[model samples]
Target: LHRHDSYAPPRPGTLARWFVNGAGYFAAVADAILRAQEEIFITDWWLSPEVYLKRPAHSDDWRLDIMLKRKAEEGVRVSILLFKEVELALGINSGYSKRALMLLHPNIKVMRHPDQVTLWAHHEKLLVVDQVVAFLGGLDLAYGRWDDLHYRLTDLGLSHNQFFWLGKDYSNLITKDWVQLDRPFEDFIDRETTPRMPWRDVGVVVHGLPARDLARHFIQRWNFTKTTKAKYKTPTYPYLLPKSTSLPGGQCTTVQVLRSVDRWSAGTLENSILNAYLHTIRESQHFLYIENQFFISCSTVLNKVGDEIVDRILKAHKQGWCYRVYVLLPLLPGFEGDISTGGGNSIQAILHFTYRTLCRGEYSILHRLKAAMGTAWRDYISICGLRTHGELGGHPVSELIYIHSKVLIADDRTVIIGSANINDRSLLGKRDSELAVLIEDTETEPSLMNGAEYQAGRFALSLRKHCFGVILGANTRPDLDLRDPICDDFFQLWQDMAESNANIYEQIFRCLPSNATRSLRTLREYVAVEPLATVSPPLARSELTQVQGHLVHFPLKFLEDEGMIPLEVWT
Candidate 1:
């Protein structure tokens, strides 16, 4: 019921504001450290020294380690938590702290918990400063994520030159000058356009009571990682201010935190996502907008209802509930280039199966029906892939827009942002580390949906529309048109451009081998062989051995069986 604008900053009295992006992440941490008078805490799946905050300047003094060391020296108790990657030692060893020696710091301590080495990863990224400010979103400290709205490859001056020079193999890399000034270089240049595929991310910053609660959640994890008896004795940084103190700035905020972890007898990540999604779907009165890396959780809806999740969403459309759902996901799975090989190919096959199962004919039928019903039904549920357009260093290279953001906004009142992808691997509590916050405004606030909320939603919607416009041209709608029917035109156009301009969707579907159906059936059989037992825990050593064998073999089945689902559905 509250009007929202996508581009504007939050209202003057914003209670809380959060930013999420790979670049923004460092900025956030730097801001937290610079502003914190009491304490700073950080937790991540992995941390590396190769990433420097002040790029183009190329100064080692700006690394996070130096900042933390400075902060600790200033009498601020700094604690860092990092997950151990099994093969991390294979790469460059630059004397940055490794996992084994993490606890040697006098004021800083690092801990690692044993996790599934093969199929799972610790992917949570969060930071809490002074127990008053906190951040939860998808951006991680890594390479190739720096870019702004300009999407420029050159002409920005020396400060921006670092973007072009950061990555290796750039000795003779093509740039604007090489193409225009160097005649011999022009002959060897296969392309002259660089696609502006800027890294996209979104997250929220919370203050007031919710921010404190979020900080407590981080402490809970920190306690869990530390020795239990020692945890109580460990001196916690003093709360920044009294818990009951309201933000003098006059802003309203609410927070609900969610987590995914291996519990001896509790629900997992998938269950938490399901609970949140159902709550939003059932309660949303106006719209539900979601941006994620993946959107394949059909089991939560159709598998239980004897239909497809897409179909159910379409049903919600026909009922005229005034609900609109927009989903943006990466067009391709990450490893399409490795499909011709051995284990990598197997992973690709499973990715293919997962795609077809989620996107095949049944999914199309629902969309077609919704398109025929009316515009309203079409508005209810829409899914579109994002692609990037622009020149990198004046070369026109258009790539698929990889929507890696894990965020959800329902109506104008509630929202969530975090690292969890919408997949079984991330949602399965026992497999990966994930965190999110549910924000709502209290009735006492004049408007639950304020300038900040609108700006966040608009930013997402605008990005979605911009990606579509780049692909479909200027005639595309100012906002997304969710009701458009899926057709051969879409497929044929992608196929035509496969060699030169294929989008992410094309990359994913094209990777399927000639015999996708046969492969998928084999995978399904493998999964169903021990049918009832796949969900159960084995008690005896022999039973455990069998379960482990099944677990190991399931990836093979996934490649052969699940790989067909997305491919067939998209086709």
Candidate 2:
């Protein structure tokens, strides 16, 4: 590991469990909170008090606020730190969340960060109970972030619209900031016409030493918040102490907690998450798998994650070795607007950076690959997105399964999972505060890759396989072989699935992310072809039937005619 990485030493003999989606994460977290006998600490980019922790929420039993109230009433102290948004900018209104949770019980307390510094938000999502178990990753305890593998398109048929997604669960940030929380449903995504954007996220539950480290992080942030934001408030929060750093029993794994914190948020500058990612990627041998909400990284100055990736891929190609990189990101930036027409400035701005980082610019990863390998770049790297479709009102509708997971797996041995994205905002330490875990598996199992025998780490191998299985349609395509990612058969299957799915989606829905639609003139022409959903429902249904999985080709050159915008203008 690099000297610039986290100060905390790696802890062994820790038990860890991976949660692929919200269904498992929320349930386990609710259960832990229920078992809390000492204290509970939570920090988030946004925390919705009314958001149900468990789905099929038939009653208020698992409502976040209600559950916290019950725990607080039991003498379990609860502390929270939320990102305080600039009133005119974001609509999450942490103010509402703070008051709502605090009013639940006197034992419940809340704080918001950057009371003095406003350039960055505290973006880490963490929940620690009794300093014994902790949950950390890309998920904030907020709305529009809970979904399983099914990725349902609608929640209309449920009673009082309450089963899975209740009011305010459908959010379109580009259209509006869910500012009016009290009303719940105002300006919400139409449950009938619009398909709710399905959220795909990853998180982990850690027991023992890693959990204590996570609790320490929360305590540092809480104390900092108190010093700057609530120095004079009544009943000053008691500074917290982390539990003993003893090794835990059952299913031991090696883990290191990493962070991106600076003078404003943590009274120190550190970007261990960035350092860990670069080190692991460079050291990886067989394959690299990445799933992130955004893949926007500048190759010029501030952030060079994209540059590092290119360096590794170029090295592998020159060495004449077989290595593969699989990247999955959202089909479109999760901003509100109609993509058939041009989207809002926010959407286009992010798309501009993302394209530049991927292939369009001279310094992009694919650009470097093309320069080195000529036409062999496709053999080494694949970038794709996920999309799922279902019927509504007897007409088939489709939407992208928004990828919010921040995960990186290398050689099926090491993994990094957390709230950080690939952009400078999350990696720059001086910018947004972030948190994550760097896990290196110690237990190994016999495995084969690249037509050779290999020893794969138990934890890393299972996580990579699970992610591959879900996105590559392994459940339905039982014949699909996913053991060797770099094998010719598997690689071709991945590319074939992406292209075939992309073609069907483009043919039926006229999705915004198509390489064919480059300029305003082309965009108009593309939308002019009435989407098959309305023009020919039967044809649309037939097209969907052929769709194998959620994978789709990411149109790297979409809107290429619109040249690069200054990153400063957007970031």
Candidate 3:
């Protein structure tokens, strides 16, 4: 609401729709760019000219730089603002090989993350085309992001562990002290025949005033990062980018665009994303489901988010209603995985530190929660990850699948999807620059239970089903027929299925060997130990199993009392 209000205020009659992953997201952006009559402006943390919007076809759609060049030739102006991470750059044209890209096409302009001193990297992923459509969310138009609804274990893609820092050829960007391009983690081995790493992300599509606001957000950022003069020859000349453009109408939903910016505010301004999370978590009545890359917060921040969740959950139990919390995260941080170094393999160290700190907070929250609820606590709160065990190079392999989505669905009324992780870096306005769209599905009245309580709307319910149903017994072969319709009656079945999924996965190990006293009992042990009738058998599958590409509980070693004890390690 202050100087940082550079991100436009809310638009009343905007039509907003959500795309679940890069598969659906990129398609729309590609379509919009192809149809652009005026301009296509994009801002991203990771942008590669070589990555494809449509893969394997090897046409203009297969190569990103190819499509933009063709558009520029057609007289559609194209501009890109990429994160100028010097260490990650190829060092051509003063650390931005993309700057050299200016020579490739007259209409295409390129800039890197503007401020060299600010630790806050330009992390917002935004695309505005012809001023009518805007795309925003976690999926960056880069390599390692392209997957469909099925989340196939092995799919066709041209990229593997490689980098395009030098030129279109990732091969040129080799591992060195000065430059490091990241390949996907060792979660699964890379082979010509195996699918490129599977990617999962979420984003939004806006058609209306919000699109203009998004365009406004982009122009403000472009102006912030733009150098005083142009270094290359272009048709647009001094005004290399358009200041603003007219937009048309689209859907009908309530949408607010939020951002995390630094320095622009006179003092420290609260990030709209942080406020959105706090507001949603505190206000959600029925169920709160969050699918984020990170789910931990520092103590001060944790009190606002985790404590709010804890309090809601406390009421859900004592009050005896369906006030549950479901969280899904990647088994490994997105940056790196087991065994790797140099070219981008080093992100693991930062991820390790983040993981340790996150664990400290998450475990403390869960530990105290367990003390309060005991076994019943299972009803209200659950944590999970995605994984699949199958063949990756003619050999059996199962590894953690990355979940890069920053999404939240509260009941069926409110939803959020964006670049902000639930960690301090993204939440605190002063740390990193972030962006997201908050939506309220006001088309339908809130759901009611027993004439006393309210439930989230159909929009929220559908997201819950989509995320949870992917792993539930619902996706079974006819002969297997193990699913119980009872699982759908309440939220408990969702947690039960996720718990079973995790129980089956704990057998796999990271790089290190483990030796510790097994004080925790398995789900079977717990069921056998207590006549609580709470434990159930795992849903088994095979290499050819039709189950979704991934679904796993938080820990493979279902320690019944892990939450009761302090967590020093993920094991």
- Compared to the true structure, candidate 1 yields what TM-score? 0.62
The model with the greatest TM-score is 2
Instruction: List the RMSD of every prediction in angstroms.
Output: 14.8, 2.5, 8.3
Model 1 collision count: 35
Cα lDDT for residue 143, candidate 2? 85
Q: Tens-digit lDDT track for model 2 on 1-571?
A: 4344685779888798888888888888888888899899998998989888887866788889999999898998898888887654577887888888888998888877777636677889999988989899999888888889888888876223454888887654444446578665344667776667788999988887788889988888877777774452545577777768461223457889999999888977889988888888888887899999888774633687777788888888888888889999998787666776787777888887888888887877888888888989998899999988889877888888889999999988888999998888888788889999988888898877987777888888888888888887888889987777777788888999999999999888887779888888888887777788888899889778889889999998788887553455244
lDDT of 1: 0.45
Ranking by lDDT: 2, 3, 1
Q: Better model by TM-score, 1 or 3? A: 3
> Candidate 3, residues 204-230: lDDT per residue as tens digits?
888766777777666766665553335
lDDT digits (tens) for residues 1-571 of candidate 1? 1112111122222355545445555665666677777677676664553445555544545556666666776777766666655554322121244432243345655545433344455677777777777766776554334443333333223332444324321111212112211111113222233322345566666665555655655665665555333433355422222243451122345455666655421122233543555565566655556677755554422322112334545556556444445555554454324232322443454355344434433443333554557544433444554443333342223344445688776654566677877666565556566777655554322221212223223323333333333334334234433221122233233223232222222222222222322454553343333322222322221232211000000011224333433322211
lDDT of candidate 2 vs native?
Answer: 0.82
Relative to the true structure, candidate 3 reaches a TM of 0.76
Worst 10 residues of 3 by lDDT: 509-518
Stretches of model 1 off by over 4 angstroms after superposition: 1-14, 54-62, 86-105, 115-119, 151-197, 228-251, 264-271, 300-315, 321-323, 336-350, 361-379, 391-395, 441-571
